[PDB]
Amino acid sequence: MTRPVRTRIAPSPTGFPHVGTAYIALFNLVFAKSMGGEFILRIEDTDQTKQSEQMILDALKWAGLSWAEGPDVGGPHAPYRQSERADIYKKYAEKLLDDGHAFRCFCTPEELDAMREAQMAAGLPVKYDGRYANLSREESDALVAQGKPFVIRMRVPSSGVCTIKDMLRGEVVIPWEQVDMQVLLKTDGLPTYHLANVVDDHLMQITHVLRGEEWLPSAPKHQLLYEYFGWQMPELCHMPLLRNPDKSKLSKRKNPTSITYYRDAGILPEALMNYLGRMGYSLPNEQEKFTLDEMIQSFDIQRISLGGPVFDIEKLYWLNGEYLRTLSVDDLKNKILAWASDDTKLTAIARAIQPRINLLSDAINWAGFYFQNLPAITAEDFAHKSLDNEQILEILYLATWQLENLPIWSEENIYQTLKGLAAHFDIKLKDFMQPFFVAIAGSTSSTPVMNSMYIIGADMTLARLRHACEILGGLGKKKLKKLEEKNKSLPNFLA
Amino acid sequence: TRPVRTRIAPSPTGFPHVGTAYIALFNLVFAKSMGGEFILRIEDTDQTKQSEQMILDALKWAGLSWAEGPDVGGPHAPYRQSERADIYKKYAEKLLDDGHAFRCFCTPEELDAMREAQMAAGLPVKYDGRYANLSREESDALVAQGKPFVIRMRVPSSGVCTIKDMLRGEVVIPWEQVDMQVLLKTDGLPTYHLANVVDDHLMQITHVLRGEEWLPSAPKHQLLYEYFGWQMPELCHMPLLRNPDKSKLSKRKNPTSITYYRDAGILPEALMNYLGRMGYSLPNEQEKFTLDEMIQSFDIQRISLGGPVFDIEKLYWLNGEYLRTLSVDDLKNKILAWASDDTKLTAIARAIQPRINLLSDAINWAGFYFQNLPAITAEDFAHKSLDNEQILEILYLATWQLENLPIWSEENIYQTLKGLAAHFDIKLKDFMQPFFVAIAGSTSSTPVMNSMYIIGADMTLARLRHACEILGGLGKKKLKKLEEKNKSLPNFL
Ligand SMILES: [Cl-]
């Protein structure tokens, strides 16, 4: 078909930029480049902040990725933001309705809940039961005239199996019964993931998509949508799931999953991408150190993994060390200084330590922790006269979660959040904060910890509170599940 | 009245001393409070080039400055005693022609048995005057024979000397206590007493502020002025700087290096404020002030007769007060510039490169290069081959040998420390374990000898001495016998 290869990444900004987003973005960039093609970027802002787009775009630039087209560099298939394409998705959703491949569902939320509880009570599969699938087109129009709100749902074949072609794995066979009557257009007239992905991929002339294997169950729905529109479905290759060393799905409890954390901790971007390539791929000779160009030159789809690479942070650090030693001394110096040369950060640090230093040589002692990764702490450091080991862990966990949700990482937001927590538990603040000095600075005496947390940033602050919870033994599965419920019940602490 | 001119005459003997800054501060202050000038003169009669630069830079940093000196020239140049030797030789021979001085041909061995015979016989130890009674004609004969000689001054046999001090008033010292001081040494260069009478005359010095420790020498200077017919300048003797125990200020207890305090983060304004608080106080009892404020209200009579105490912690607190007066911007820049030495940074990056895996590891491995004194304990100096006693012998000998390097280079440090290991029946690996703790504060760190070169002589010796205090120190005659051993040690460089 000699159709120009084009791939994309379609991140949905939700605060911290995830390593998985860079990992997937890496392999679409690599494949497209190895075929003489283009790699573009599309922001799928689902509104689940205004600047959260800038967060993800900056995190991918630092990581070493770049895109031919996108919301910032422009492109022929603009706009490259889902928020600015609402008219497009509604247009095509109604085209499926016209062609009989979709139908309006008028079920209310109460009716859907009842439908799900009846199925569970009968042990039946929990899925949409086709309440409005057989409604004729004229009848569907009549209810819209009465003002009945509705969604648009895709039809699904009644029997048989779906046959998907994966570039690496080959044939994929999923029974059609296991495919939901997916909601394409919501009541507010905005799309769901599946309608927007098919429409945007086709209009931007995407030819290949590489995505996590978690999306395999969705693949039949994508095939149906392309058939309904009469569009050429791009080829699909599924990447292996990122895992913790214990082989569970990657999670921020064991090790951080933020790109900007690894920047703040001292990992060169080239090393991080080097390691994420090894999470789903092996080069022709199984070389563990390589650059993006080396990976592109010899890229082979059949070398993509389905096996059991794991995300061992210690191995990532080893690899970074091999990068650091292959730099010249001058390059290393300029990298250390640049990595710590944020003028705004330095001014704040001087303001913080000015009351406590008697010599210029005291600065390194009071300000050293601002540039460490994880301070050297022990369970005994968290000794507390008023609070016991269990209560300290609860404070660290609840604070970690509440702090993770801040729309902006400001000193005042941090203060209102931890002050709100202390007030909610009727613990005087000075006792409430004793653990944070240990976790953040590594000792009981330091600069005001709330200001230190603002300076080091969200990624480092959260990495040191989670480390402290590990240092204190963590909490069991049962005791932690209850604590998570307690967290959902907390009030909003921001005025 | 003559224009007021003060000076200092420091010897470039290596590490500049805070006491030199102390005296220079009050000579400069007094001259400026009198519509006069301040002079710098280099007493480099005894032999270097680097040492002279080290001391001029040390005083400039402290904030002192001079109207004439070796660097800036002046109407009474040269301002180095090494470039004035022929001048001192002429005057010392003038006293000979006039009968106020005589040639003494005593060989060193003769002098040694002179004092030994005096001590064993219970007689005062001084010059017995055996060559004093030679006539000129007899003296010239020995010179033609090639007999080497010095020139000694004559002293009245009886009577007293009245010394007009500006603070103590009148100080009478009998002539019996004043020796026939050597004026010209055996090879033609002056001693301190001849050089300073001559230079203070030619350079038109009118007042001299000097440590009280040199008061016994004052009668000798007065005699030299009387012999030459010159107007002796007015003397004022400052109180001596003391350790916290009231003893003479000694490197052994506290650090005495001006440049050490620069390396430790002491602002020069803080150091000058503290040195100015030793002898002299300000009218409103105020303990924080500037150079000009000291000058304006300056009065000789407000100088202290008692011995001031040099508490290192009081200096650190004062610097803390100075730091807090800066804006955040000025404080930030002062910290970065204090550590911005590009050669030091390139050395540090090279040293930590084999041992870091993250950029966040830099501060953990490089933190000690910018500390003052690492936090250490006697438990940290736990050696298998050595006990607490043996390690102390190692650190003291290293400190003494490392204070005498001509040039502070890594190569010189390696040859030194390697040699001491050889003449100790100690393998080099075990010899350096204490050095890792004292310097880096940790048993694990970058190569310790390279580190000692980066941080400089001042900081390395400060941390080695601080280690000796931590282990408990070896005083009494234990340090006296060790001093003898260091003297008998061979040369390594
Ligand atoms: Cl003097």
PDB file of C-alpha atoms in Angstrom, chain A residues 264-268 317-318 320-322 324-330 332-333 335-337 339 343 346-347 350-351 353-355 357-365 368-369 371-373, chain B residues 263-267 316-317 319-321 323-329 331-332 334-336 338 342 345-347 349-350 352-354 356-364 367 370-372:
ATOM      1  CA  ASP A 264      15.262  14.931  40.291  1.00  0.00           C
ATOM      2  CA  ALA A 265      17.144  11.891  41.644  1.00  0.00           C
ATOM      3  CA  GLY A 266      20.039  12.227  39.175  1.00  0.00           C
ATOM      4  CA  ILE A 267      19.260   9.733  36.390  1.00  0.00           C
ATOM      5  CA  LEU A 268      20.363  11.028  33.000  1.00  0.00           C
ATOM      6  CA  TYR A 317      21.082   3.105  38.826  1.00  0.00           C
ATOM      7  CA  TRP A 318      23.895   0.760  37.775  1.00  0.00           C
ATOM      8  CA  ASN A 320      23.262   5.410  34.990  1.00  0.00           C
ATOM      9  CA  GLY A 321      26.658   4.891  36.600  1.00  0.00           C
ATOM     10  CA  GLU A 322      27.966   3.396  33.375  1.00  0.00           C
ATOM     11  CA  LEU A 324      28.382   8.796  34.202  1.00  0.00           C
ATOM     12  CA  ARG A 325      31.795   7.146  33.850  1.00  0.00           C
ATOM     13  CA  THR A 326      31.782   7.343  30.035  1.00  0.00           C
ATOM     14  CA  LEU A 327      31.370  11.117  30.279  1.00  0.00           C
ATOM     15  CA  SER A 328      34.457  13.298  30.413  1.00  0.00           C
ATOM     16  CA  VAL A 329      35.320  14.954  33.709  1.00  0.00           C
ATOM     17  CA  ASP A 330      34.291  18.350  32.336  1.00  0.00           C
ATOM     18  CA  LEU A 332      30.238  15.383  34.420  1.00  0.00           C
ATOM     19  CA  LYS A 333      30.970  18.615  36.292  1.00  0.00           C
ATOM     20  CA  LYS A 335      25.956  18.072  34.447  1.00  0.00           C
ATOM     21  CA  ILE A 336      26.109  18.019  38.253  1.00  0.00           C
ATOM     22  CA  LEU A 337      26.022  21.815  38.449  1.00  0.00           C
ATOM     23  CA  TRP A 339      21.201  19.569  37.481  1.00  0.00           C
ATOM     24  CA  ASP A 343      18.297  29.853  40.601  1.00  0.00           C
ATOM     25  CA  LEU A 346      18.983  28.137  45.292  1.00  0.00           C
ATOM     26  CA  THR A 347      17.543  31.446  46.494  1.00  0.00           C
ATOM     27  CA  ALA A 350      19.754  30.287  51.134  1.00  0.00           C
ATOM     28  CA  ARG A 351      16.727  32.004  52.672  1.00  0.00           C
ATOM     29  CA  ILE A 353      19.497  28.200  56.008  1.00  0.00           C
ATOM     30  CA  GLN A 354      20.455  31.818  56.722  1.00  0.00           C
ATOM     31  CA  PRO A 355      19.101  31.670  60.320  1.00  0.00           C
ATOM     32  CA  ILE A 357      24.484  28.874  59.570  1.00  0.00           C
ATOM     33  CA  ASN A 358      27.439  30.509  61.304  1.00  0.00           C
ATOM     34  CA  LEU A 359      29.940  29.844  58.499  1.00  0.00           C
ATOM     35  CA  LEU A 360      29.767  29.465  54.753  1.00  0.00           C
ATOM     36  CA  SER A 361      31.101  25.950  55.408  1.00  0.00           C
ATOM     37  CA  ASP A 362      27.972  25.067  57.415  1.00  0.00           C
ATOM     38  CA  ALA A 363      25.834  25.377  54.280  1.00  0.00           C
ATOM     39  CA  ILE A 364      26.573  21.874  52.976  1.00  0.00           C
ATOM     40  CA  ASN A 365      25.387  20.334  56.252  1.00  0.00           C
ATOM     41  CA  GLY A 368      22.805  18.790  51.698  1.00  0.00           C
ATOM     42  CA  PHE A 369      19.472  16.982  51.882  1.00  0.00           C
ATOM     43  CA  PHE A 371      20.229  17.376  46.691  1.00  0.00           C
ATOM     44  CA  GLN A 372      20.272  13.847  48.128  1.00  0.00           C
ATOM     45  CA  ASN A 373      17.957  11.158  46.765  1.00  0.00           C
TER      46      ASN A 373
ATOM     47  CA  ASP B 263      38.546  28.256  53.833  1.00  0.00           C
ATOM     48  CA  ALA B 264      36.141  27.586  56.733  1.00  0.00           C
ATOM     49  CA  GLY B 265      33.647  30.256  55.681  1.00  0.00           C
ATOM     50  CA  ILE B 266      34.666  33.156  57.944  1.00  0.00           C
ATOM     51  CA  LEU B 267      33.863  36.518  56.391  1.00  0.00           C
ATOM     52  CA  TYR B 316      32.005  31.696  64.724  1.00  0.00           C
ATOM     53  CA  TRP B 317      28.973  33.257  66.430  1.00  0.00           C
ATOM     54  CA  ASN B 319      30.355  35.501  61.742  1.00  0.00           C
ATOM     55  CA  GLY B 320      26.838  34.135  62.152  1.00  0.00           C
ATOM     56  CA  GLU B 321      25.703  37.650  63.020  1.00  0.00           C
ATOM     57  CA  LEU B 323      25.927  36.399  57.642  1.00  0.00           C
ATOM     58  CA  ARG B 324      22.386  37.185  58.827  1.00  0.00           C
ATOM     59  CA  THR B 325      22.781  40.872  57.906  1.00  0.00           C
ATOM     60  CA  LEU B 326      23.165  39.949  54.228  1.00  0.00           C
ATOM     61  CA  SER B 327      20.226  39.699  51.874  1.00  0.00           C
ATOM     62  CA  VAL B 328      19.330  36.229  50.615  1.00  0.00           C
ATOM     63  CA  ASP B 329      20.877  37.122  47.254  1.00  0.00           C
ATOM     64  CA  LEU B 331      24.387  35.363  51.064  1.00  0.00           C
ATOM     65  CA  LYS B 332      23.739  32.936  48.205  1.00  0.00           C
ATOM     66  CA  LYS B 334      28.935  34.603  48.872  1.00  0.00           C
ATOM     67  CA  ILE B 335      28.454  30.867  49.466  1.00  0.00           C
ATOM     68  CA  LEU B 336      28.794  29.935  45.792  1.00  0.00           C
ATOM     69  CA  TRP B 338      33.428  30.757  48.343  1.00  0.00           C
ATOM     70  CA  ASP B 342      36.842  25.896  38.962  1.00  0.00           C
ATOM     71  CA  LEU B 345      35.451  21.578  41.170  1.00  0.00           C
ATOM     72  CA  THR B 346      37.065  19.779  38.226  1.00  0.00           C
ATOM     73  CA  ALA B 347      39.278  17.896  40.680  1.00  0.00           C
ATOM     74  CA  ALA B 349      34.225  15.715  39.827  1.00  0.00           C
ATOM     75  CA  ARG B 350      37.131  13.606  38.590  1.00  0.00           C
ATOM     76  CA  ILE B 352      33.988  11.042  42.614  1.00  0.00           C
ATOM     77  CA  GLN B 353      33.301   9.835  39.054  1.00  0.00           C
ATOM     78  CA  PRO B 354      34.376   6.195  39.697  1.00  0.00           C
ATOM     79  CA  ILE B 356      28.778   7.612  41.878  1.00  0.00           C
ATOM     80  CA  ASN B 357      25.783   6.158  40.067  1.00  0.00           C
ATOM     81  CA  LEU B 358      23.446   9.170  40.325  1.00  0.00           C
ATOM     82  CA  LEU B 359      23.977  12.910  40.224  1.00  0.00           C
ATOM     83  CA  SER B 360      22.280  12.924  43.648  1.00  0.00           C
ATOM     84  CA  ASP B 361      25.269  10.916  44.935  1.00  0.00           C
ATOM     85  CA  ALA B 362      27.569  13.893  44.338  1.00  0.00           C
ATOM     86  CA  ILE B 363      26.839  15.643  47.641  1.00  0.00           C
ATOM     87  CA  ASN B 364      27.236  12.414  49.652  1.00  0.00           C
ATOM     88  CA  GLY B 367      30.311  16.897  50.975  1.00  0.00           C
ATOM     89  CA  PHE B 370      33.231  21.983  51.637  1.00  0.00           C
ATOM     90  CA  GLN B 371      32.769  21.106  55.311  1.00  0.00           C
ATOM     91  CA  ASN B 372      34.779  22.760  58.078  1.00  0.00           C
TER      92      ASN B 372
END
